[PDB]
mmCIF file with all atom_site columns, all heavy atoms in Angstrom:
data_model
loop_
_atom_site.group_PDB
_atom_site.id
_atom_site.type_symbol
_atom_site.label_atom_id
_atom_site.label_alt_id
_atom_site.label_comp_id
_atom_site.label_asym_id
_atom_site.label_entity_id
_atom_site.label_seq_id
_atom_site.pdbx_PDB_ins_code
_atom_site.Cartn_x
_atom_site.Cartn_y
_atom_site.Cartn_z
_atom_site.occupancy
_atom_site.B_iso_or_equiv
_atom_site.pdbx_formal_charge
_atom_site.auth_seq_id
_atom_site.auth_comp_id
_atom_site.auth_asym_id
_atom_site.auth_atom_id
_atom_site.pdbx_PDB_model_num
ATOM 1   N N   . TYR N 1 36  ? -14.101 16.511 -13.153 1.00 0.00 ? 1158 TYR N N   1
ATOM 2   C CA  . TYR N 1 36  ? -15.206 15.801 -12.587 1.00 0.00 ? 1158 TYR N CA  1
ATOM 3   C C   . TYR N 1 36  ? -16.430 16.214 -13.336 1.00 0.00 ? 1158 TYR N C   1
ATOM 4   O O   . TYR N 1 36  ? -16.399 17.160 -14.114 1.00 0.00 ? 1158 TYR N O   1
ATOM 5   C CB  . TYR N 1 36  ? -15.379 16.101 -11.108 1.00 0.00 ? 1158 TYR N CB  1
ATOM 6   C CG  . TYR N 1 36  ? -14.424 15.358 -10.191 1.00 0.00 ? 1158 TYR N CG  1
ATOM 7   C CD1 . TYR N 1 36  ? -13.218 15.936 -9.788  1.00 0.00 ? 1158 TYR N CD1 1
ATOM 8   C CD2 . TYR N 1 36  ? -14.741 14.087 -9.705  1.00 0.00 ? 1158 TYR N CD2 1
ATOM 9   C CE1 . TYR N 1 36  ? -12.350 15.266 -8.936  1.00 0.00 ? 1158 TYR N CE1 1
ATOM 10  C CE2 . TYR N 1 36  ? -13.877 13.407 -8.849  1.00 0.00 ? 1158 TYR N CE2 1
ATOM 11  C CZ  . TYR N 1 36  ? -12.684 14.002 -8.467  1.00 0.00 ? 1158 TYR N CZ  1
ATOM 12  O OH  . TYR N 1 36  ? -11.823 13.340 -7.622  1.00 0.00 ? 1158 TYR N OH  1
ATOM 13  N N   . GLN N 1 38  ? -20.913 16.326 -12.915 1.00 0.00 ? 1160 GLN N N   1
ATOM 14  C CA  . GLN N 1 38  ? -22.029 16.147 -12.040 1.00 0.00 ? 1160 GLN N CA  1
ATOM 15  C C   . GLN N 1 38  ? -23.306 16.061 -12.829 1.00 0.00 ? 1160 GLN N C   1
ATOM 16  O O   . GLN N 1 38  ? -23.813 17.054 -13.314 1.00 0.00 ? 1160 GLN N O   1
ATOM 17  C CB  . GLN N 1 38  ? -22.089 17.294 -11.047 1.00 0.00 ? 1160 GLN N CB  1
ATOM 18  C CG  . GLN N 1 38  ? -22.937 17.025 -9.854  1.00 0.00 ? 1160 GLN N CG  1
ATOM 19  C CD  . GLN N 1 38  ? -22.926 18.172 -8.878  1.00 0.00 ? 1160 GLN N CD  1
ATOM 20  O OE1 . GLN N 1 38  ? -23.045 17.979 -7.673  1.00 0.00 ? 1160 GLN N OE1 1
ATOM 21  N NE2 . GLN N 1 38  ? -22.768 19.371 -9.389  1.00 0.00 ? 1160 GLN N NE2 1
ATOM 22  N N   . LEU N 1 103 ? -8.927  19.277 -3.302  1.00 0.00 ? 1225 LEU N N   1
ATOM 23  C CA  . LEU N 1 103 ? -8.867  19.894 -4.578  1.00 0.00 ? 1225 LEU N CA  1
ATOM 24  C C   . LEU N 1 103 ? -9.626  21.202 -4.569  1.00 0.00 ? 1225 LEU N C   1
ATOM 25  O O   . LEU N 1 103 ? -10.525 21.399 -3.767  1.00 0.00 ? 1225 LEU N O   1
ATOM 26  C CB  . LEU N 1 103 ? -9.421  18.936 -5.633  1.00 0.00 ? 1225 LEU N CB  1
ATOM 27  C CG  . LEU N 1 103 ? -10.773 18.345 -5.263  1.00 0.00 ? 1225 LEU N CG  1
ATOM 28  C CD1 . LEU N 1 103 ? -11.176 17.265 -6.237  1.00 0.00 ? 1225 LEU N CD1 1
ATOM 29  C CD2 . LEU N 1 103 ? -10.708 17.789 -3.878  1.00 0.00 ? 1225 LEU N CD2 1
ATOM 30  N N   . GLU N 1 129 ? -46.411 43.826 -7.575  1.00 0.00 ? 1251 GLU N N   1
ATOM 31  C CA  . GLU N 1 129 ? -46.076 44.734 -6.472  1.00 0.00 ? 1251 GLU N CA  1
ATOM 32  C C   . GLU N 1 129 ? -46.948 44.540 -5.218  1.00 0.00 ? 1251 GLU N C   1
ATOM 33  O O   . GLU N 1 129 ? -48.095 44.068 -5.310  1.00 0.00 ? 1251 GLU N O   1
ATOM 34  C CB  . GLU N 1 129 ? -46.139 46.187 -6.959  1.00 0.00 ? 1251 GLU N CB  1
ATOM 35  C CG  . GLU N 1 129 ? -47.448 46.565 -7.593  1.00 0.00 ? 1251 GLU N CG  1
ATOM 36  C CD  . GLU N 1 129 ? -47.409 47.941 -8.239  1.00 0.00 ? 1251 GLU N CD  1
ATOM 37  O OE1 . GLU N 1 129 ? -46.298 48.496 -8.416  1.00 0.00 ? 1251 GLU N OE1 1
ATOM 38  O OE2 . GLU N 1 129 ? -48.488 48.462 -8.580  1.00 0.00 ? 1251 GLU N OE2 1
ATOM 39  N N   . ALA N 1 133 ? -53.220 45.119 2.311   1.00 0.00 ? 1255 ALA N N   1
ATOM 40  C CA  . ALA N 1 133 ? -52.920 44.753 3.691   1.00 0.00 ? 1255 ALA N CA  1
ATOM 41  C C   . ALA N 1 133 ? -51.432 44.862 3.999   1.00 0.00 ? 1255 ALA N C   1
ATOM 42  O O   . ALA N 1 133 ? -50.972 45.881 4.500   1.00 0.00 ? 1255 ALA N O   1
ATOM 43  C CB  . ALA N 1 133 ? -53.415 43.347 3.978   1.00 0.00 ? 1255 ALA N CB  1
ATOM 44  N N   . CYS N 1 171 ? -35.551 36.412 -1.744  1.00 0.00 ? 1293 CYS N N   1
ATOM 45  C CA  . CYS N 1 171 ? -35.776 34.999 -1.685  1.00 0.00 ? 1293 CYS N CA  1
ATOM 46  C C   . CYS N 1 171 ? -36.308 34.544 -3.028  1.00 0.00 ? 1293 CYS N C   1
ATOM 47  O O   . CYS N 1 171 ? -37.329 35.030 -3.495  1.00 0.00 ? 1293 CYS N O   1
ATOM 48  C CB  . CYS N 1 171 ? -36.794 34.676 -0.583  1.00 0.00 ? 1293 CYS N CB  1
ATOM 49  S SG  . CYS N 1 171 ? -36.858 32.910 -0.032  1.00 0.00 ? 1293 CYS N SG  1
ATOM 50  N N   . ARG N 1 195 ? -38.778 42.000 -0.283  1.00 0.00 ? 1317 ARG N N   1
ATOM 51  C CA  . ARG N 1 195 ? -39.601 42.664 0.696   1.00 0.00 ? 1317 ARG N CA  1
ATOM 52  C C   . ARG N 1 195 ? -38.809 43.794 1.290   1.00 0.00 ? 1317 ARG N C   1
ATOM 53  O O   . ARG N 1 195 ? -37.674 43.613 1.688   1.00 0.00 ? 1317 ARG N O   1
ATOM 54  C CB  . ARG N 1 195 ? -40.025 41.672 1.771   1.00 0.00 ? 1317 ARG N CB  1
ATOM 55  C CG  . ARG N 1 195 ? -41.170 42.142 2.647   1.00 0.00 ? 1317 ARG N CG  1
ATOM 56  C CD  . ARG N 1 195 ? -41.689 40.994 3.531   1.00 0.00 ? 1317 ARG N CD  1
ATOM 57  N NE  . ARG N 1 195 ? -42.931 41.339 4.221   1.00 0.00 ? 1317 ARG N NE  1
ATOM 58  C CZ  . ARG N 1 195 ? -43.612 40.499 4.994   1.00 0.00 ? 1317 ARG N CZ  1
ATOM 59  N NH1 . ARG N 1 195 ? -43.173 39.261 5.181   1.00 0.00 ? 1317 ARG N NH1 1
ATOM 60  N NH2 . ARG N 1 195 ? -44.728 40.894 5.577   1.00 0.00 ? 1317 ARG N NH2 1
ATOM 61  N N   . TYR L 2 35  ? -17.445 18.610 1.549   1.00 0.00 ? 1480 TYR L N   1
ATOM 62  C CA  . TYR L 2 35  ? -17.619 19.788 0.734   1.00 0.00 ? 1480 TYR L CA  1
ATOM 63  C C   . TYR L 2 35  ? -19.051 20.224 0.840   1.00 0.00 ? 1480 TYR L C   1
ATOM 64  O O   . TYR L 2 35  ? -19.945 19.409 1.069   1.00 0.00 ? 1480 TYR L O   1
ATOM 65  C CB  . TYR L 2 35  ? -17.284 19.504 -0.722  1.00 0.00 ? 1480 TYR L CB  1
ATOM 66  C CG  . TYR L 2 35  ? -15.854 19.104 -0.973  1.00 0.00 ? 1480 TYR L CG  1
ATOM 67  C CD1 . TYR L 2 35  ? -15.446 17.789 -0.823  1.00 0.00 ? 1480 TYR L CD1 1
ATOM 68  C CD2 . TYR L 2 35  ? -14.923 20.030 -1.385  1.00 0.00 ? 1480 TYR L CD2 1
ATOM 69  C CE1 . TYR L 2 35  ? -14.170 17.420 -1.054  1.00 0.00 ? 1480 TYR L CE1 1
ATOM 70  C CE2 . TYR L 2 35  ? -13.636 19.665 -1.623  1.00 0.00 ? 1480 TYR L CE2 1
ATOM 71  C CZ  . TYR L 2 35  ? -13.261 18.353 -1.452  1.00 0.00 ? 1480 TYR L CZ  1
ATOM 72  O OH  . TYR L 2 35  ? -11.964 17.974 -1.681  1.00 0.00 ? 1480 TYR L OH  1
ATOM 73  N N   . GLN L 2 37  ? -22.092 22.250 -1.121  1.00 0.00 ? 1482 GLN L N   1
ATOM 74  C CA  . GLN L 2 37  ? -22.475 22.754 -2.407  1.00 0.00 ? 1482 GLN L CA  1
ATOM 75  C C   . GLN L 2 37  ? -23.829 23.441 -2.395  1.00 0.00 ? 1482 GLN L C   1
ATOM 76  O O   . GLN L 2 37  ? -24.823 22.875 -1.967  1.00 0.00 ? 1482 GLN L O   1
ATOM 77  C CB  . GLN L 2 37  ? -22.468 21.646 -3.449  1.00 0.00 ? 1482 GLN L CB  1
ATOM 78  C CG  . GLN L 2 37  ? -22.738 22.163 -4.872  1.00 0.00 ? 1482 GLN L CG  1
ATOM 79  C CD  . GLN L 2 37  ? -22.613 21.084 -5.934  1.00 0.00 ? 1482 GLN L CD  1
ATOM 80  O OE1 . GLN L 2 37  ? -22.425 21.380 -7.108  1.00 0.00 ? 1482 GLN L OE1 1
ATOM 81  N NE2 . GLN L 2 37  ? -22.704 19.831 -5.522  1.00 0.00 ? 1482 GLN L NE2 1
ATOM 82  N N   . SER L 2 96  ? -9.934  11.445 -5.327  1.00 0.00 ? 1541 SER L N   1
ATOM 83  C CA  . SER L 2 96  ? -11.048 11.663 -4.419  1.00 0.00 ? 1541 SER L CA  1
ATOM 84  C C   . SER L 2 96  ? -12.306 11.061 -4.968  1.00 0.00 ? 1541 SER L C   1
ATOM 85  O O   . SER L 2 96  ? -12.725 11.386 -6.065  1.00 0.00 ? 1541 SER L O   1
ATOM 86  C CB  . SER L 2 96  ? -11.276 13.155 -4.196  1.00 0.00 ? 1541 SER L CB  1
ATOM 87  O OG  . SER L 2 96  ? -10.177 13.744 -3.563  1.00 0.00 ? 1541 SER L OG  1
ATOM 88  N N   . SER L 2 123 ? -48.114 45.280 -11.422 1.00 0.00 ? 1568 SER L N   1
ATOM 89  C CA  . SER L 2 123 ? -47.823 46.704 -11.580 1.00 0.00 ? 1568 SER L CA  1
ATOM 90  C C   . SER L 2 123 ? -47.567 46.988 -13.013 1.00 0.00 ? 1568 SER L C   1
ATOM 91  O O   . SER L 2 123 ? -46.414 47.072 -13.435 1.00 0.00 ? 1568 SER L O   1
ATOM 92  C CB  . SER L 2 123 ? -46.589 47.093 -10.792 1.00 0.00 ? 1568 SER L CB  1
ATOM 93  O OG  . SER L 2 123 ? -45.420 46.609 -11.433 1.00 0.00 ? 1568 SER L OG  1
ATOM 94  N N   . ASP L 2 135 ? -45.314 34.997 5.754   1.00 0.00 ? 1580 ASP L N   1
ATOM 95  C CA  . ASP L 2 135 ? -45.217 35.224 7.189   1.00 0.00 ? 1580 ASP L CA  1
ATOM 96  C C   . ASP L 2 135 ? -45.831 34.105 8.004   1.00 0.00 ? 1580 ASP L C   1
ATOM 97  O O   . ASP L 2 135 ? -46.262 34.319 9.133   1.00 0.00 ? 1580 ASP L O   1
ATOM 98  C CB  . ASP L 2 135 ? -45.869 36.555 7.567   1.00 0.00 ? 1580 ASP L CB  1
ATOM 99  C CG  . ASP L 2 135 ? -45.265 37.737 6.820   1.00 0.00 ? 1580 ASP L CG  1
ATOM 100 O OD1 . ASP L 2 135 ? -44.893 37.570 5.650   1.00 0.00 ? 1580 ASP L OD1 1
ATOM 101 O OD2 . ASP L 2 135 ? -45.184 38.836 7.404   1.00 0.00 ? 1580 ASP L OD2 1
ATOM 102 N N   . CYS L 2 156 ? -40.404 29.762 0.423   1.00 0.00 ? 1601 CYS L N   1
ATOM 103 C CA  . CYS L 2 156 ? -39.089 30.380 0.221   1.00 0.00 ? 1601 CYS L CA  1
ATOM 104 C C   . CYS L 2 156 ? -38.755 31.318 1.385   1.00 0.00 ? 1601 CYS L C   1
ATOM 105 O O   . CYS L 2 156 ? -39.393 32.358 1.554   1.00 0.00 ? 1601 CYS L O   1
ATOM 106 C CB  . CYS L 2 156 ? -39.112 31.180 -1.091  1.00 0.00 ? 1601 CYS L CB  1
ATOM 107 S SG  . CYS L 2 156 ? -37.535 31.878 -1.635  1.00 0.00 ? 1601 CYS L SG  1
ATOM 108 N N   . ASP L 2 193 ? -58.604 39.489 3.213   1.00 0.00 ? 1638 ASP L N   1
ATOM 109 C CA  . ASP L 2 193 ? -58.777 40.924 2.945   1.00 0.00 ? 1638 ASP L CA  1
ATOM 110 C C   . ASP L 2 193 ? -60.028 41.234 2.081   1.00 0.00 ? 1638 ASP L C   1
ATOM 111 O O   . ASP L 2 193 ? -61.035 40.519 2.143   1.00 0.00 ? 1638 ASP L O   1
ATOM 112 C CB  . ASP L 2 193 ? -57.513 41.482 2.284   1.00 0.00 ? 1638 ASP L CB  1
ATOM 113 C CG  . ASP L 2 193 ? -56.237 41.212 3.122   1.00 0.00 ? 1638 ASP L CG  1
ATOM 114 O OD1 . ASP L 2 193 ? -56.330 40.477 4.135   1.00 0.00 ? 1638 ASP L OD1 1
ATOM 115 O OD2 . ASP L 2 193 ? -55.159 41.737 2.762   1.00 0.00 ? 1638 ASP L OD2 1
#
Side-chain angles (χ1 to χ4, degrees):
Chain N
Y1158 281 94
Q1160 197 178 211
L1225 50 188
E1251 55 188 13
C1293 197
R1317 195 170 190 177
Chain L
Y1480 297 84
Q1482 186 175 201
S1541 296
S1568 74
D1580 303 35
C1601 187
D1638 305 7

